[PDB]
Amino acid sequence: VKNSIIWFRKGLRLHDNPALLEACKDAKHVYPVFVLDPHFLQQKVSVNRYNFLLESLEDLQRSFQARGSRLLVLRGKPEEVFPRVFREWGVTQLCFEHDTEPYAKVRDAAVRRLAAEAGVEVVTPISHTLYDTDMLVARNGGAAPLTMQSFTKLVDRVGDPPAPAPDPPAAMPPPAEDMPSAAPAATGVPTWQEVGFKEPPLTVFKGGETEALARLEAAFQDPKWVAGFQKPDTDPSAWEKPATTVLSPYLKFGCLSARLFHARLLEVYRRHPAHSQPPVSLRGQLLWREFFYTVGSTTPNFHRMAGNPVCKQIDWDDNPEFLAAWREARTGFPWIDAIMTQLVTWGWMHHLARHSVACFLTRGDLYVSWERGMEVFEEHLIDQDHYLNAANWMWLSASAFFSQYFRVYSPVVFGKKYDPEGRFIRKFLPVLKDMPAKYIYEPWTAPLEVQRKAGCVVGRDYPAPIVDHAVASKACIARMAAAYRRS
């Protein structure tokens, strides 16, 4: 008979899941599996991101229980757990969504070898990306496009991405009873307390497919907003209602299908003819993701400077003091420190807020490597994605895809244009809550009498600027200009 495993790694969803539909097909028993390494901590990851994963698994659990089945969270490494359960469960087919990340390729190969030894058929559909990213490279003549203009041209030549896959059946073949490796007490979803985390998650975005589809429908409640979306014109200071979709954590874990999102965009575009076009449109934002997945998956050492054929070799400074101040939100520049606090508190910041902090640490003020910034973002972002985090840090550091190092964001003026009263700053830096708006972006300029009334004396309650932006940016630009002459 047919006994199948659907292995979740990403794709933590039941919609547009071609691997689950194939697994459930003609199956006597389907085994829904997530593999959790119980020592991933003891070895880098925030409770905000890890708990979002756990909430995503608890949603999957509820969804499978509704359909007569059960999510099995196996503890161990895939290479050691799958050979046993292949034979324990009499598995004939193993299904999972294809992953193009470097560690994914090594892991999936070894598992595919194990499945062959056990007589197990492997089916690996593509669904995390709009397209088969290797088909895009082959249609482009064997190399990934290196500009979005050429990439947008390529996808339009290829045509619409595949349609979202149908929904799974209302009743699923369950695991077989009294299998020892599927015992309930060994296969449940743990809490954040039981994985070793001692401080609670604080983010306001809840994990799971059910919340991802609720947040999708919220975005599409105003079609005219979807149609006219222009990414560079949105507001980074907006926190009560963020100015973009905040679907990124759900797309990263696959709680939301990229293809379903794309299909819903085109239906709105069909009825709104003046709709915005790539790159600034919402569809364009999914294409930024695909562009970076396509380049990054075909580029060696993509997450690194050294050995990376697309990254400029820049002489960044090893300055732990500047880095530490940036990471711990104590630069003395409230726009920067507020954004870095939202990072550690919510794990999500608007795209231009990320611009402001990434420029500051790299080609604008502190001249620290974008790798040191990417590592900090990897720990705290709930949307952390190998290829998107790496390419946007190379972009922001003018090390790849971007070359206009004379455009330096001001850590004082940038946010002021959107939020003159500093509502964003007061929310995330309550120490400045009583600071008059005239000084809230430059508190070191306030007379001492003003500092004492507001309760924020610089050097006592809030740090002093670690640099003079005018001096620092002028130095950093000079150095960047000599490097671009050096290459």
Ligand SMILES: Cc1cc2nc3c(=O)[nH]c(=O)nc-3n(C[C@H](O)[C@H](O)[C@H](O)COP(=O)(O)OP(=O)(O)OC[C@H]3O[C@@H](n4cnc5c(N)ncnc54)[C@H](O)[C@@H]3O)c2cc1C
């Ligand atoms: C230094 C830096 C690091 C970043 N690291 C990440 C990361 O780890 N994970 C991540 O998802 N994005 C990352 N981004 C890209 C971008 O800032 C986020 O995708 C965006 O802020 C998510 O908000 P949203 O879902 O509201 O996006 P929307 O504007 O609503 O866009 C919809 C979707 O398009 C995709 N998208 C949007 N902007 C980009 C972009 N610039 N590059 C690639 N895909 C994009 C995302 O999947 C996003 O959810 C980074 C950007 C910078 C400057």
Ligand SMILES: [Cl-]
């Ligand atoms: Cl500016």
